[PDB]
């Protein structure tokens, strides 16, 4: 069972694995984001609502006047899309906000509001997203590609190796806020630990600690453990729990209770300590000398002196022990020490500290931050203060606090947006542990860390920027609050927010023209993610690592599709099912593998929570019961793969193709091609310019439906009904009633566009595909876009192709064609270039669009119209004129050669001069349409009036149909009311149905109903008039102009560029090539059956480029066509349907057990015929990416044709009619027409302009530029004694102005001879160094 629009041409699908989940809606990313950006909801938590409830409420400078926010609403599109597309305006809306100013009663906060004063305030014009996830900025259609960046939080960097080359590994830890200032801690080659702020100079972290108002003793407390002494009779029995004595040698016999356990000079074992805990020792003998190195815990005062017998962190000495122990404070504290269990790195940092207090600590903070300034305590205070805890300059998004407490393994997801002293200490502790050897680092590209942005996010960010600006302003405004003389608007400047928004959209490197020449590329240019621009690395900052692929990329990012060249992996794309976690993280559908069942339940999992599990690959069977029919199954847990038990696993993939992006999910027989060739394939596929007709590729991938319907160029019903009035210009469906709303029973009117320009000058049009009267269901395709076909994507044309060498005409990559395809013109493509001529006003007076032009041959002038606008259909070429637009003269530009004539004729002669819109040299073609734009209230001319009358007549038509359709039900009910009570036969029809309430019907409540529904009729009439004249006003009227202009005209050239030796064509398999020569039909190799073969590729292609996929495709395609010659023949000779359906069903059986399971006995036997005629051209075949069609089925189908199972057959030359030994391979293969056309590349330059700062001939092709002649060439020339060549090359043809003039003369008068001269730009350098005082000279 299928969509009734699917039954129109059903494609056979090989493929053994069923699916449990459909493909989701592709563009869902942009939709969800931008939706989430403008959504009035509780708490907001996001978008406008967030920034509003953040910045607002807001008040005076404690001046007891407050500015509070309540609510908001998005205004409206004043127009719709196509309207803007016409004019060139930004599709947008305003933002209506609810505010209130509330001043306070005098000398009391809670003191009554001086005035509750609110108002609705205008602010900003946010653009809006089409239903296809794009934008309209200035007519044009940009797209916002989403970024991906390093999530905010904290990270543990390793930096192995090259640190000091000592072999030791350094470390560092970095905290990054969403917005704010980062922070770093790190090491020196000497185990010294340091802070660094804003990647500025390095400072001892001790300084930070001091800033925390921290006694250095409290620092020591934080990090190290405790060690306790008591002064004995002698030998200082220290407290001990035996554990810490794991890993030490006995310089003295470890003893307790007298019974020694360790001998003098014995390294204690762990098991010793074990039996020692069994002995439970606490106090131990100590050679006091052994205590020389144990630094003091902290300070130590005396009592009689009352003075510090020791300061915090003093190096312990024996006499020092005397002083200490003398004073009887037997409780002595020092610190635990170790090297491979507790490295004592804090102590030395303390040593190096030059600081004493919190205050001088802040002083250092300042000095390092702002240099050289003699500080005031308060300066540094405020600096550090707002540096890390004030929302003015720092924030962690919720995802921040999340990741933060997460990496810290703590158990809270919530928190603040700002830090805490704790947090920093926690960082330092963790890093110290890492330094000891407990704890592991992170790596960069591990997707568990890289988060993803969207449009709504960066949107609200720029929004915050603008809001902060107007915040500063209006805050200072409320500062001068003139009480009660101010509504909450007068203080409000609503310009700059809109300014910033418009900037962002119209200008941000995360915004570019929608790549628009394919329903494919249009969708590739949205499901694309990068790490460039603000918050990403730089195209030449590119580090190797990020530019690679991380095994975590599984099913989250296409492995194979990225635009190669100067950047790889940076502009990689997104896979099929991959969603986005609410935090901008990725997830992936996954099925539960319960006790023995791979059930049908599914979830979505991150890049890290995933790591705990083992998950089954796709291509492995189960017994319809989840039990892998095998036992050791291919699985994966973490950067790994292995055979696993029948019950180790936890999950399974959803479907094979969930590994790749859609831009590859098509190129069939993928698992028979290398990745490189697959890469070139997908990329060169992305640029298949749409040609004239549209034929499907015969071999597909079963995944071309969900491309179209999710693309835009289609046209799809919104509810079932009946096609009622088709036309090549528009579609009229009567909706069905149960799918209809009370008011406006209505008719779905689809206004397909005709030929309009794509962003790269390629036609588009939405041609219908339906039959008048046919029904459609709720959501079927109605009209097709470029390179589309009945809902099938169709990017090229499939062709009978042969594989063999031929007179070198396929030597390197020459593709060789016959006339017979360009005979059919099946590779022609139209092109559309918009040309524009405006009318502003310079000084000296404004300008005109007259047909009145000086010093031009009237021959040309004739071609224009009376206005000055050439007509529709004039085949035009370059060096001509399309509009006449003339300017006043001006003075400094008056040559004597016209001073003459202006003297004679009277100065009414040289007052004006031409600016006409020409035809850009190098182009030709035909005019299709001309748009003319003028200021309204300013005069509108002939053409303007014509466009007016046409468009209004048109727009009236549909609503005319509307009323005349919806009304007639009223006369239905009317006569239904007159029927009962003497129905009249010919009064109701031979007379106007309006002429029913003039005939006297027996006047009871039924005539009351007559007059009732008559008034209702007339009311609906008049309000229909209201609607239509609203439309008339809106359309008839002109259009505002960016003031400074008067009126502008746009003209639409068009050209049909067909094909030529030089163009670039390629199959989806990265097998590109230029068509070299096109011989006559008679010379193409022909089979015995007469039929010649279109193109003859090269055989050498496969060995080097190990991409078998092409050949297998070709064989399958020959097979697929091999159903045509069967059905077509069976049908041409007439035939009853029985055998037809029979052969159909058979051909559809044709394979191993697949998901297809179609049946044709279903049909009412006519649609059978429809299907057959769809087939008549050939049979369409489907094969998913990794659920393919093995060789055996291909041999099979081939037999079901009539062909030799090899696929090879014998052929004859067409120039000697003799047989080809070694039978060759022909089949049917999809070829695409790559849009690098030669006529865009050829370019010459006899001589033209020159740059002015240096008279070198200008560059580029738009300019008549000369080629680039390089230093490499300079050498390649010096290798030969090619002297005069090089000289005359680089002076006489480049810069020697005198010289080049002399040359030009001598050559155009028959004398090849050169005057050397001396370069010019050299003199430029000479004077350029003369600029600086370095006097340069040129000795005799």
């Amino acid at each position: 069972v299928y969509s009734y629009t699917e039954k129109k041409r059903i494609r056979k699908d090989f493929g053994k694995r069923p699916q449990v989940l459909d493909v989701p809606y592709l563009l869902s990313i942009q939709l969800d984001s931008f939706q989430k950006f403008i959504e009035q909801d509780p708490e907001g938590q996001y978008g406008l609502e967030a920034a509003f409830r953040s910045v607002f409420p807001i008040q005076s400078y404690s001046g007891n006047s407050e500015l509070q926010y309540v609510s908001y609403r998005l205004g409206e599109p004043v127009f719709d899309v196509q309207e803007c597309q016409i004019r060139g305006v930004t599709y947008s809306a305003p933002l209506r906000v609810k505010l209130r100013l509330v001043i306070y009663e005098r000398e009391a906060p809670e003191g009554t509001v001086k005035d509750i004063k609110e108002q609705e305030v205008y602010m900003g014009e946010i653009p809006l997203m089409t239903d296809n996830g794009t934008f309209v900025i200035n007519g044009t259609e940009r797209v916002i590609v989403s970024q991906l960046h390093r999530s905010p939080g904290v990270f543990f960097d390793s930096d192995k190796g090259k640190t000091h080359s000592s072999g030791k590994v350094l470390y560092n830890a970095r905290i990054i806020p969403y917005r704010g200032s980062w922070l770093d801690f790190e090491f020196d080659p000497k185990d010294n630990l340091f802070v660094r702020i804003d990647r500025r100079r390095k400072l001892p972290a001790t300084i930070i600690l001091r800033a925390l108002n921290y006694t250095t003793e409290q620092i020591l407390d934080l990090f190290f453990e405790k060690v306790i002494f008591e002064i004995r009779d002698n030998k200082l029995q220290m407290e001990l729990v035996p554990e810490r004595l794991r890993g030490e040698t006995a310089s003295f016999d470890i003893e307790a209770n007298g019974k020694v356990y360790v001998e003098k000079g014995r390294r204690i074992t762990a098991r010793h300590i074990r039996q020692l805990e069994k002995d439970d020792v606490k106090l131990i003998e100590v050679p006091v000398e052994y205590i020389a190195g144990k630094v003091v815990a902290k300070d130590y005062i005396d009592e009689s002196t009352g003075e510090l017998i020791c300061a915090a962190n003093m190096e312990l000495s024996l006499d020092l022990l005397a002083k200490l122990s003398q004073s009887g404070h037997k409780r002595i504290e020092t610190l635990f020490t170790n090297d491979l269990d507790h490295g004592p790195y804090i102590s030395e940092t303390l040593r190096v500290d030059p600081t004493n207090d919190r205050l001088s600590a802040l002083v250092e903070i300042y000095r390092m931050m702002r240099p050289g300034e003699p500080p005031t305590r308060e300066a540094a205070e405020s600096l550090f203060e707002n540096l890390f805890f004030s929302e003015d300059r720092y924030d962690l998004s919720a995802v921040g606090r999340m990741k933060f407490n997460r990496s810290l393994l703590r158990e809270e997801i919530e928190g603040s947006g700002i830090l805490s002293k704790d947090d920093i200490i926690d960082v330092m502790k963790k890093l110290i542990d890492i330094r000891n050897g407990k704890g592991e680092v992170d790596d960069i590209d591990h997707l568990g860390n890289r988060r993803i942005r969207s449009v709504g996010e960066m949107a609200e960010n720029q929004f915050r920027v603008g809001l902060v600006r107007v915040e500063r302003a209006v805050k200072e405004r409320l500062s001068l609050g003139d009480l009660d003389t101010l509504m909450p608007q007068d203080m409000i400047n609503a310009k700059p927010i809109s300014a910033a928004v418009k900037e962002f959209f119209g200008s941000s490197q995360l915004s570019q023209f929608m790549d628009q020449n394919n329903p494919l590329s249009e969708i590739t240019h949205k499901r694309r993610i990068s790490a460039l621009g603000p918050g990403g690395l730089t195209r030449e900052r590119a580090g190797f690592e990020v530019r690679d692929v991380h095994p975590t990329h599984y099913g989250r990012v296409c492995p194979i599709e990225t635009p190669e060249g100067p950047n790889i992996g940076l502009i990689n794309s997104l896979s099929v099912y991959a969603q986005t976690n609410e935090y901008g993280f990725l997830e992936t559908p996954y099925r539960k593998v319960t006790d023995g069942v791979v059930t049908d339940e599914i979830h979505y999992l991150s890049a890290i929570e995933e790591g705990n599990y083992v998950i089954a690959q796709a291509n492995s069977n189960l017994d319809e019961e989840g039990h892998f029919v095998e036992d050791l199954v291919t699985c994966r847990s973490k950067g790994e793969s292995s055979l696993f038990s029948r019950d180790q696993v936890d999950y399974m993939d959803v479907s094979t193709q969930q590994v790749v992006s859609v831009g590859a999910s098509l190129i069939p027989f993928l698992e028979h091609d290398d990745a490189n060739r697959a890469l070139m394939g997908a990329n060169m596929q992305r640029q298949a310019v749409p040609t004239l007709r549209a034929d499907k590729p015969l071999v597909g991938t079963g995944m071309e439906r969900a491309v179209a319907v999710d693309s835009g160029v289609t046209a799809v019903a919104k509810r079932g009904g009946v096609v009622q009035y088709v036309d090549a210009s528009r579609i009229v469906i009567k909706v069905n009633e149960d799918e209809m709303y009370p008011g406006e029973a209505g008719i779905d009117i689809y206004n397909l566009t005709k030929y309009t320009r794509s962003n790269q000058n390629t036609c588009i049009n939405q041609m219908p595909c339906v039959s008048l009267g046919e029904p459609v269901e709720r959501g079927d395709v109605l009209a097709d876009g470029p390179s589309t076909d009945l809902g099938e994507l169709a990017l090229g044309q499939n062709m009978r192709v042969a594989f063999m060498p031929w007179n070198g005409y396929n030597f390197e990559d020459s593709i060789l064609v016959s006339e017979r395809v360009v005979q059919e013109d099946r590779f022609t493509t139209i092109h559309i270039q918009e040309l524009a001529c405006v009318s502003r006003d310079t000084k000296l007076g404004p300008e005109e669009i007259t047909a009145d032009i000086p010093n031009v041959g009237e021959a040309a002038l004739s071609k224009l119209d009376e206005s000055g606008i050439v007509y529709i259909g004039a085949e035009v070429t370059g060096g001509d004129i399309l509009v006449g637009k003339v300017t006043p003269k001006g003075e400094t530009q008056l040559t004597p050669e016209e001073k003459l004539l202006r003297a004679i004729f009277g100065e009414k002669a040289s007052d004006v001069k031409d600016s006409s819109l020409r035809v850009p040299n190098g182009v030709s073609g035909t005019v299709i349409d001309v748009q003319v734009f003028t200021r309204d209230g300013v005069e509108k001319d002939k053409r303007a009036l014509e466009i007016e009358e046409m468009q209004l007549k048109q727009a009236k038509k549909d609503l005319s149909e509307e009323l005349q359709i919806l009304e007639a039900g009223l006369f239905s009910r009317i006569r239904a009311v007159l029927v009962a009570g003497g129905v009249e036969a010919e009064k109701l029809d031979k007379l106007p149905r309006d002429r029913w309430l003039e005939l006297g019907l027996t006047d009871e409540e039924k005539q009351n109903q007559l007059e009732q529904l008559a008034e209702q009729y007339d009311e609906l009439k008049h309000e229909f008039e209201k609607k239509l004249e609203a439309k008339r006003r809106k359309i008839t009227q002109g259009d505002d102009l960016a003031p400074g202009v008067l009126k502008i005209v746009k003209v639409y050239l068009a050209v049909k560029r067909r094909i030529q030796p030089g163009d670039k064509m390629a199959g989806r398999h990265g097998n590109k090539g230029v068509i070299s020569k096109i011989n006559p039909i008679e010379d193409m190799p022909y089979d015995e059956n007469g039929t010649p073969v279109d193109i003859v590729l090269n055989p050498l292609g496969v060995p080097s480029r190990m991409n078998i996929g092409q050949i297998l495709e070709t064989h399958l395609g020959m097979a697929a066509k091999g159903i045509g010659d069967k059905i077509n023949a069976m049908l041409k000779q007439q035939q009853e349907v029985a055998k037809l359906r029979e052969f159909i069903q058979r051909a559809y059986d044709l394979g191993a057990d697949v998901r297809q399971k179609v049946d044709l006995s279903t049909f009412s036997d006519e649609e059978v015929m429809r299907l057959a005629e769809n087939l008549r051209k050939g049979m369409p075949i489907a094969t998913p990416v990794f659920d393919g069609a093995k060789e055996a089925e291909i041999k099979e189908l081939l037999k079901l044709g009539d062909l030799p199972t090899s696929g090879q057959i014998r052929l004859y030359d067409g120039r000697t009619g003799e047989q080809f030994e070694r039978p060759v391979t022909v089949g049917y293969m999809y070829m695409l027409k790559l849009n690098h056309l030669v006529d865009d590349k050829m370019h010459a330059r006899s001589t033209g302009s020159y740059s002015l700062v240096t008279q070198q001939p200008l560059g580029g092709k738009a300019q008549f530029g000369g080629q680039r002649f390089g230093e490499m060439e300079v050498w390649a020339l010096e290798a030969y004694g090619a002297a005069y060549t090089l000289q005359e090359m680089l002076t006489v043809k480049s810069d020697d102005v005198n010289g080049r003039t002399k040359m030009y003369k001598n050559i155009v008068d028959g004398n090849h001879q050169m005057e050397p001269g001396m370069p010019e730009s050299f003199n430029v350098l000479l004077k350029e160094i003369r600029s600086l005082g370095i006097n340069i000279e040129l000795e005799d």
Partner: protein, 91 residues
């Protein structure tokens, strides 16, 4: 906006305050702080208006040259130089 401008701005304001210190009553205007404040304020706005309309003049000179070499002109940009060169001129 611009560090480079800001340097010259402050230069202006400083000289302005220098010369204007000459005359400052005490019996009235019991504060010199705001005096110098608004003095420099005005100096700044003077400087900035000068520079704005200078670069405006640059735009104006530009837009009056479309006759460079051959066909194939541009429409998008020119309108924007124009529209700025108009906006600034509004003042």
């Amino acid at each position: 906006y611009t560090q480079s401008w800001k340097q010259e701005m402050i230069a202006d304001g400083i000289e302005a305050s220098i010369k204007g210190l000459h005359n400052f009553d005490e019996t009235k205007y019991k504060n010199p702080h705001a005096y110098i404040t608004q003095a420099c304020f005005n100096a700044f706005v003077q400087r900035i208006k000068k520079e704005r309309k200078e670069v405006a003049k640059k735009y104006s000179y530009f837009v009056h040259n479309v006759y460079d070499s051959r066909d194939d002109d541009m429409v998008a940009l020119v309108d924007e130089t124009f529209i700025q060169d108009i906006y600034d001129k509004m003042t």
